Amino acid sequence: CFEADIAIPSGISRPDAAALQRCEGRVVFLPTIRRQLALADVAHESFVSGGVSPDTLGLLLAYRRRFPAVITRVLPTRIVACPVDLGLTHAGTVNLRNTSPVDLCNGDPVSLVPPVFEGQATDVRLESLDLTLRFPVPLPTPLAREIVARLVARGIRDLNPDPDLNVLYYNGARLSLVADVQQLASVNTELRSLVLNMVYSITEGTTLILTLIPRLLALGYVNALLQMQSVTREAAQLIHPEAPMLMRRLPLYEALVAWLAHAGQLGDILALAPAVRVCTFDGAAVVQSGDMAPVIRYP
Amino acid sequence: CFEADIAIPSGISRPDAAALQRCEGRVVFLPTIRRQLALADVAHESFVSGGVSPDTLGLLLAYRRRFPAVITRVLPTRIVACPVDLGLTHAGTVNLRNTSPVDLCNGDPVSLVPPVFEGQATDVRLESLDLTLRFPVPLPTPLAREIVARLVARGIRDLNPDRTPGELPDLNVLYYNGARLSLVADVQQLASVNTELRSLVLNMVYSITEGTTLILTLIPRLLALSAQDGYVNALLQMQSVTREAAQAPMLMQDGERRLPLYEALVAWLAHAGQLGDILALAPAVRVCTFDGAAVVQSGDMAPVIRYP
Amino acid sequence: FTAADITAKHRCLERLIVETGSAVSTATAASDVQFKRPPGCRELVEDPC
Amino acid sequence: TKPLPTAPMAWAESSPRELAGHAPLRRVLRPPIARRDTRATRDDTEQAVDKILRGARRAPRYHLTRQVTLTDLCQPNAERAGALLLALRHPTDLPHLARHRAPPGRQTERLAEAWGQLLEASESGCARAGLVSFNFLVAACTAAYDARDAAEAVRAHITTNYAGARLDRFSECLRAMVHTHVFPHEVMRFFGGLVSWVTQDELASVTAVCSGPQEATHTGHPGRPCSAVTIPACAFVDLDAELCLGGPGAAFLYLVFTYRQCRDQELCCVYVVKSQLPPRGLEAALERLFGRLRITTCTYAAFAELGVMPDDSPRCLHRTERFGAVGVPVVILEGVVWRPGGWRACA
Amino acid sequence: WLVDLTTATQPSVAVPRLTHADTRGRPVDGVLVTTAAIKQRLLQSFLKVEDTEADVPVTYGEMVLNGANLVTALVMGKAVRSLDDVGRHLLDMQEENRETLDELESAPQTTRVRADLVAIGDRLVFLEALEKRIYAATNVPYP
Amino acid sequence: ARHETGGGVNFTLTQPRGNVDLGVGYTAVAATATVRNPVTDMGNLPQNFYLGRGAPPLLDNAAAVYLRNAVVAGNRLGPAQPLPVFGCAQVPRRAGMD
Amino acid sequence: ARHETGGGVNFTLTQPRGNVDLGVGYTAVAATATVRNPVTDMGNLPQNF
Amino acid sequence: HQPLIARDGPHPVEQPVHNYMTKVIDRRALNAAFSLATEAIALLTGEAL
Amino acid sequence: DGTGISLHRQLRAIQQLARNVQAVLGAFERGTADQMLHVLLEKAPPLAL
Amino acid sequence: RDPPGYRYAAAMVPTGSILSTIEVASHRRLFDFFARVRSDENSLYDVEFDALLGSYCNTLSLVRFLELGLSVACVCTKFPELAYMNEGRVQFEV
Amino acid sequence: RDPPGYRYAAAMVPTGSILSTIEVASHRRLFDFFARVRSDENSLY
């Protein structure tokens, strides 16, 4: 499996040692696959980058840069977590813990940042050694992508506001997005930076094509084919946005470069590529929330 | 590991065989998934389309088609490379030799690129049997997507063709960390730039929906943040069309229960979000180092693991 | 011009040369004018055409 | 009985580093650091315990998924040794979603009536209904997609083994789904190869391969006293065999749903493509070969990659297997490795 | 044209009990059946090659049901040729590639029948008209 | 047969078995001899037809819904919320039963 | 070489070989005796540009 | 069972092939009749002497 | 297993193995005689020349 | 499945005894196959079989190369290190 | 008609030897069961 053994620090309180015992089956992101790693390297205090604790975007960056490893056995003075990325595909079944929706017999769980749901719920603080652990939520890819996009949209409405995105019907019972209270104010403040990169990359994408199409096809097969299948779609959207907006090949091309990059950087952050699949056997076939679920390395 | 053997033909001069000895860890594109193959199917002479060598946007389209294979070992009469697009199933992590001015870090997805820098060494001429080998340059996808954008736009702006005076912006020069990186500006071919332009134009259209207009309402609101936050200030690049685009709902809501915002995101995210991938070849590998060395120097061997 | 018959055959030449040795003929040599073949009897002609 | 050329068979007719591994490491003591200066029944029990011996003396080319479902849809017995089973997920959204993602001018009530109607045609308790067979799709869309009676021969197979109602009800559901922008994909992902069903009454426990090669399974002539094994496309109607022009490479196997959006009134086409192209090249060749782009949105096909057939040649086409009285063009695929893949259709 | 005819087809199934074609040794491997006019013509000019007038043909082969051949046809209901040897070898392997077993016996009885054999290329072949010998007065057409 | 499960390895033993009734007639007989309990309260709960839908409704939509909730008001098995086209018709569950 | 396979286990046999010509000059020779078939139909197709 | 030749080059490696086929014996029956004359019975059976 | 059935299947599987070995060992004898030709035809010019 | 039928021979050597005597046409449906033969019937005497009348295998012929014509056109030596070899050179002085 | 199938046991003790060696499978349907196996198959055991 290639186990990597995280070293618990010096003496921890008895209630903290029982906090870790309950963390078996939880996903950890380990910065390097070194066999011997510290606990502080894994703890959420190690996600600090710009001097701040990362937002939901800063997290999703890190989740794409380090290695998630499921916790297999927690031992006093060691945590044994087996990285998801290493070894052959479809092997090393290690048990997960389900959080929220069911995780049916397949569907490739994505580990998405915690704040998307009850924020501090899952912080799991350890006071004795003064560190904390935020475990990502294991959701299926279709639902994980539906949610993360669902919340960004809510964020956009919230950006300037004067049909509920929140109610979600998954499987047997309607799922709930909103925890009401100020959790939304905490959820919305962390998606704040993800919403903007989304708003920007759209507004910067349209205006950049809406300027380019009329500032191209006017200088062959480009022209004909373009306007051909774009009838009442691109051109109509051109007149309508240019109606409620303003209108340079040299800044155009140099902005088309900087956008094209920033765009694909968001497609990478977003799309929450699945870490694992569920393939069960002699098992329930649906893993009820909070129950260990079999799981295998590639989708 | 479904390794594909590649037979060295006849005898390539002891100096040529010494050149292949150091090509282990480099990448090959094979035009099939095979068990028996000829050395000449891999050579740059095979990249030649009818009568013509593809340009450096033509190669990306050729590396789009066929399969990247990283050479594992080279024997006297065969070359062993396991086709990453398929046979990536190894317990541990095939070695990729970093050939680039760049440096991998840890976790960087690695997408390949035709050789494209101002100072470069990708010739490897083998005189005994007429053939050559251009090895692609591995590169982090953030950087490899910045390059493709540079080559695309350079082939495009030239194509307008910019009316405006003869002094255009750079677009030929990058920076990765420090280290100015000067791309090779040499030829652009109609067909190679067309498809790259065709699919660029095509996808940026499909990313525009009804709900998109709801977002375009927010441009004046963005520039309100341009100026009262230090972030969001940084977000808007100085050369931002959006900034020039501000220099609205339109009613028309079809029964009110569709959720066009959400649907507009999904639509944009698919087509426009995935442009590095469609314009260029997406990463299939990411650096991982077991020994805990956290970078890969240029010229070193990067332990590499399956897709990001 | 039948295309009810030409399509209904198979394409493998292994077999079509052996059934060209003995193909039931469409005619009869037992009439005064050549008739269509009565259902009961089979000629087993050669008939390359 | 022994050769002339001995070195080639000692390896053929059939480690020491692990032996040498424990040798320096384990044999070494107190390292490191250094100081200076009862005929048959009895036989059976013993063998089971022993089997636990050898299998516990040691320790990956196979994966089995197992699930319990009903025989309403699907049905393992009708099917055989090599078959595609597709999962079906969450009947709960009888178009609940139809509320959203359904464009205006759409009576999103179609699914709830089409689908709830399907249930009336064929409650929740002991089990649920998952596992749609490949077969059952070929018949449901048989009259829909392009070839008829090679396609309908499959439909005759299911009505006589697996009900024309359910086929018709399920076809009405496929029409209603393709209607309202909830597709047959984003439902029905690939499940496996059907190793062994173990059914009771209306119940079935289906073992099937999550991934890995098929031919290496229960094997035998046939699995259990049934017949042989194969991944037979089941249609000379399906098994669209690409690579009209080709060179040796591992053939590949994909799963494609083709649709009609008022050109034919929400057509459902389901078949398999076999050619050597890595998914980044299949989207291109799917753009060609297809005129189904009728807007008459623009989302014509959706595909996922099932796996490899790491040998080009086994593509037998046989309109020759009996799943009861009915006979079906059956194409046999010799050797297959299953890579589940993911569903990609953006356009 | 006759070496083409005589070497076109391809041999099959060595049958030892069929020491059917011979003259001074040298088995005959084929038959030319013709009409009586072609055989005549052919044998007046063309291929007159002639180590004939005598062939030692064989006699009839036999198959019967004995032993376990019956029990399995009566019970169960199936039969296999030479189940004695088949069952013996298959069982001998249970305790104890190059499967040569076959079956060897008889070296049958021969005769001298006035035959007509010819050498076409390098081969021996019978020439047989057959219209007279069998079809003559029988009112049957000649195939 | 062994299959690796979550945090373990799982051996499933199976045994094939088959059987015939040897008898040409009737060889086993059963006799109910007593009743443990009724397993059911043997009471009054009515049928509520508003749990299913087989029946086209009243054509005045006010007469239709005035009707429904006059019957469904307090039923012991009255539906829980408006009937979803899927799930179940949802009999409520009472807090105790005897 | 064992190397697994999909649906089985292959074993590739191989063998390195080598060869030289011992003729100081012109050994072997080859002639043509007759033509089996023409292959290509020998006639009449344009070149479309 | 079929023999094979070991190829060197970009020729896909050939592995032995085997062929199992099973032909079904064609069936037939033959006829003839020597039918006897009435008076001839009453002679050879005695019965008329 | 321990049935007399598991034994005849094994004996049958050895029968297939050493039947393929014998087939691929004779492949290097057939392949040598074949590869001779190729290297002789490679160095031979037509008689006409 | 349609019953395979009753086996009349192997009914001649019973393995056991029925201990009751009843009218079994009442219990008609407790069985996969059933027949009432009042006195005698022609179906008791039916026998049939199908046979395998031969198995013809093939002896794969091995060619040895040294016994041929073509072998006189070369000099064949076993040089086991040829894998480890780099160049083969031959020199002629004429 | 779902024809017979090759009897593997009966093989192993041939009643004769086919002299002609040729690439069969051209003469495909001269037989009502023809199976072509390559290195070996799963179905012979």
d(CA A297, CA E111): 80
Task: Please say whether the beta carbons of A75 and A69 come within 8 A.
Answer: no
Chain B: partners with 3+ C-beta pairs within 8 Å? A, D, G, H, J
Angle, CA of A180, A183 and A188, to the nearest 5°:
105
d(CA E55, CA D34): 97
Task: Please say whether the beta carbons of D329 and D153 come within 8 A.
Answer: yes
Q: How far is CA H32 from CA E130, H27, H29, H35, in A?
A: 21, 18, 11, 9
By C-alpha distance, which of D283, D276, D275 is closest to D300? D283
Task: Please say whether the beta carbons of K3 and K29 come within 8 A.
Answer: no
- Produce one character per residue of J57-70: b if its CB has 16 or more CB atoms within 10 Å, e if not: bbebeeeeeeeeee
D309: enclosing H helix or E strand: strand D301-309
Contacts of H2 in chain J (CB under 8 A): 60
Angle, CA of E14, E16 and E21, to the nearest 5°:
90
Largest Cα separation within chain H, whole Å, is: 96
d(CA D334, CA D215): 8
d(CA A139, CA A113): 10
- Choose from B10, B35, B86 for mutation: most chain G CBs within 10 A: B35
d(CA A40, CA A47): 10
- Going by the DSSP 8-state scheme, the letter that residue B7 receives in this structure is B
Asked if omega into F82 is within 30° of 0 (cis), the reply is no
Determine, for residues D215 and G5 on separate chains, whether the beta-carbon distance falls below 8 Å.
no
Chain D: partners with 3+ C-beta pairs within 8 Å? A, B, F, G, I, K
> How many CB pairs lie under 8 A apart between chains A and F?
23
By C-alpha distance, which of A225, A223, A203 is closest to A159? A203
Give the gap in angstroms from C-alpha G15 to the nearest C-alpha of chain I.
9
D332: enclosing H helix or E strand: strand D327-332
H43: enclosing H helix or E strand: helix H38-44
Helix (H, G, I), strand (E, B) or coil at B148: helix
d(CA B55, CA A26): 49
Chain centroid, CA F60 distance in Å:
34
- For the record, the structure tokens of D94 come out as 């009888």
Pairing between strand J51-52 and D132-133?
A: unpaired
- Produce one character per residue of B88-123: b if its CB has 16 or more CB atoms within 10 Å, e if not: bbeeebbbbbbbbbbbbebbbbbbbbbbbbeeeebe
By C-alpha distance, which of B138, B120, B121 is closest to B19? B121
Amino acid identity of D238? D
B138: which residues sit within 8 A by CB, 6+ positions away?
B27, B96, B98, B99, B100, B104, B110, B111, B112, B113, B302
- Choose from F3, F5, F12, F14 for mutation: most chain A CBs within 10 A: F5
Contacts of B14 in chain J (CB under 8 A): 86-87
Q: Is F8 at the interface with chain A, CB within 8 A?
A: no
HSE value, Cβ hemisphere, 13 Å, CA-based, for G34: 2
Phi, psi of B285 (to 5 degrees): -140, 155
- For the record, the structure tokens of D70 come out as 């009903």
By C-alpha distance, which of I15, B2, J83 is closest to D7? J83
Q: How far is CA A111 from CA A23, A59, A92, A116, in A?
A: 15, 11, 18, 11
d(CA D271, CA D154): 13
Which experimental method was this entry solved with?
cryo-EM
Determine, for residues G13 and D213 on separate chains, whether the beta-carbon distance falls below 8 Å.
no
Handedness of CA A53, A55, A56, A59 (dihedral sign): negative
DSSP strands (E only) in chain E = 30-33, 79-80, 117-118, 125-128
Task: Please say whether the beta carbons of A110 and A139 come within 8 A.
Answer: yes
- For the record, the structure tokens of B68 come out as 């990247």
Task: Please say whether the beta carbons of A219 and B157 come within 8 A.
Answer: no
Q: How far is CA B271 from CA A155, B39, D302, in A?
A: 22, 38, 15
What's chain D's length in residues? 347
The torsion of the CA quartet D104, D110, D116, D121, rounded to 10 degrees, works out to: -160
Phi, psi of D212 (to 5 degrees): 105, 175
Task: Please say whether the beta carbons of D109 and D117 come within 8 A.
Answer: no
Give the gap in angstroms from C-alpha J63 to the nearest C-alpha of chain F.
47
d(CA B65, CA D282): 10
Helix H segments across I1-49? 4-42
Contacts of I2 in chain D (CB under 8 A): 43-44, 47
Q: How far is CA B77 from CA B70, G23, I34, J78, J84, in A?
A: 18, 26, 20, 19, 10
- For the record, the structure tokens of D265 come out as 């009134």
The string of DSSP letters for D124-183 reads -SS-----EEHHHHHHHTTTTSS--SSSHHHHHHHHT---HHHHHHHHHHHHHHHHTT--
Q: Is B273 at the interface with chain A, CB within 8 A?
A: yes
Pairing between strand B301-306 and K34-37?
A: unpaired
Q: How far apart are the first and last CA of chain G?
A: 49
By C-alpha distance, which of B67, B122, B73 is closest to B100? B122
By C-alpha distance, which of B94, B49, B48 is closest to B68? B94
A55: which residues sit within 8 A by CB, 6+ positions away?
A190, A191, A192, A193, A194
Determine, for residues D116 and F85 on separate chains, whether the beta-carbon distance falls below 8 Å.
yes
d(CA J47, CA E71): 12
Give the gap in angstroms from C-alpha J32 to the nearest C-alpha of chain B.
54
By C-alpha distance, which of B79, B72, B17, B12 is closest to B42? B79
DSSP strands (E only) in chain B = 4-6, 27-30, 67-74, 79-82, 95-97, 109-113, 137-140, 173-175, 180-182, 285-287, 301-306
By C-alpha distance, which of B217, A262, D144, I42 is closest to G21? I42
Amino acid identity of G25? G
Pairing between strand J56-57 and K16-17?
A: parallel
Residue F18: how many CB atoms within 10 A of its CB?
Answer: 4
Give the gap in angstroms from C-alpha G23 to the nearest C-alpha of chain B.
20
Nearest beta carbon to residue I19 from set E90, E94, E97: E97
A266: which residues sit within 8 A by CB, 6+ positions away?
A197, A198, A201, B269, B273
By C-alpha distance, which of J54, E86, J53 is closest to K12? E86
Whether chain D lies against chain C with 3 or more Cβ pairs closer than 8 A is no
Determine, for residues G24 and J94 on separate chains, whether the beta-carbon distance falls below 8 Å.
yes
Task: Please say whether the beta carbons of J54 and K16 come within 8 A.
Answer: yes
Determine, for residues D221 and K2 on separate chains, whether the beta-carbon distance falls below 8 Å.
no
Residue pointed to by tokens 């990448």:
B27
- Going by the DSSP 8-state scheme, the letter that residue B236 receives in this structure is S
Residue I24: how many CB atoms within 10 A of its CB?
Answer: 22
The torsion of the CA quartet I38, I40, I41, I46, rounded to 10 degrees, works out to: 180
Residue pointed to by tokens 């996969």:
J32
Whether chain F lies against chain A with 3 or more Cβ pairs closer than 8 A is yes
d(CA A31, CA A64): 11
Task: Please say whether the beta carbons of D235 and D328 come within 8 A.
Answer: yes
- For the record, the structure tokens of J46 come out as 């039916």
Task: Please say whether the beta carbons of J74 and G28 come within 8 A.
Answer: no
Chain centroid, CA F77 distance in Å:
13
By C-alpha distance, which of E20, E11, E4, E12 is closest to E110? E20
Contacts of I21 in chain D (CB under 8 A): 3, 9, 12
- Produce one character per residue of F65-82: b if its CB has 16 or more CB atoms within 10 Å, e if not: eeebeeebeebebbbbee
Task: Please say whether the beta carbons of A24 and A39 come within 8 A.
Answer: no
- For the record, the structure tokens of B39 come out as 């050395």
Helix (H, G, I), strand (E, B) or coil at B192: helix
C30: enclosing H helix or E strand: none
Q: Is F11 at the interface with chain D, CB within 8 A?
A: yes
Chain F: partners with 3+ C-beta pairs within 8 Å? A, D, J
K19: which residues sit within 8 A by CB, 6+ positions away?
E11, E12, E13, E14
- Going by the DSSP 8-state scheme, the letter that residue E113 receives in this structure is B
Nearest residue on chain J to G19, alpha-carbon basis: J88
Give the gap in angstroms from C-alpha D145 to the nearest C-alpha of chain A.
26
- Produce one character per residue of D135-165: b if its CB has 16 or more CB atoms within 10 Å, e if not: bbbbbbbbebbeeeeebebbbbbbbebbeee
Give the gap in angstroms from C-alpha D248 to the nearest C-alpha of chain I.
22
Pairing between strand E125-128 and E30-33?
A: parallel
Determine, for residues G10 and H6 on separate chains, whether the beta-carbon distance falls below 8 Å.
no
Determine, for residues I33 and J65 on separate chains, whether the beta-carbon distance falls below 8 Å.
yes
- For the record, the structure tokens of F13 come out as 């033993």
Determine, for residues D43 and I21 on separate chains, whether the beta-carbon distance falls below 8 Å.
no
What's chain C's length in residues? 49
By C-alpha distance, which of A253, D83, D247 is closest to B169? A253
d(CA E28, CA E34): 17
d(CA A100, CA A117): 9
Q: Is J73 at the interface with chain I, CB within 8 A?
A: yes
Nearest beta carbon to residue A159 from set B109, B169, B218: B218
Residue A1: how many CB atoms within 10 A of its CB?
Answer: 17
Determine, for residues K7 and J58 on separate chains, whether the beta-carbon distance falls below 8 Å.
no
Amino acid identity of A83? P
Pairing between strand E79-80 and J51-52?
A: parallel
d(CA D317, CA D314): 9
d(CA B279, CA D145): 34
Task: Please say whether the beta carbons of D250 and D308 come within 8 A.
Answer: yes
Amino acid identity of D17? R
By C-alpha distance, which of A244, A129, A266 is closest to A198? A266
Beta bridge partners of B30: B67
Task: Please say whether the beta carbons of K35 and D314 come within 8 A.
Answer: no
Angle, CA of C43, C48 and C49, to the nearest 5°:
100
Give the gap in angstroms from C-alpha I44 to the nearest C-alpha of chain D.
31
Amino acid identity of A228? M
d(CA A252, CA A213): 11
Q: HEC states along chain A?
A: CCCEEEECCCCCCHHHHHHHHCCCCCEEEECCCCCEEEHHHHCHHHCCCCCCCCCHHHHHHHHCCCEEEEEEEEECCEEEEEECCCCCCCCCCCCEECCCCCCECCCCEEEECHHHCCCCCCCCCECCCCECCCCCEEEEHHHHHHHHHHHHHHHHHHHCCCCCCCCEEECCEEECCCCCCCHHHHHHHHCHHHHHHHHHHHHHHHHHHHHHCCCCCCCCHHHHHHHHHCCCCHHHHHHHHHCCCCCCHHHHHHHHHHHHHHHHHHHHHCCCCCCCECCCCCCCCECCCCCEECCECCC
Beta bridge partners of B82: B70
d(CA B273, CA B162): 28
Residue pointed to by tokens 């900034």:
B243
d(CA A263, CA B240): 14
Contacts of H1 in chain J (CB under 8 A): 57-58, 60
Task: Please say whether the beta carbons of A70 and A109 come within 8 A.
Answer: no
Give the gap in angstroms from C-alpha K41 to the nearest C-alpha of chain G.
9
- For the record, the structure tokens of A255 come out as 């902005």
Beta bridge partners of D344: D303
Q: How far is CA B129 from CA B74, B75, B298, D70, F85, in A?
A: 17, 17, 30, 65, 73
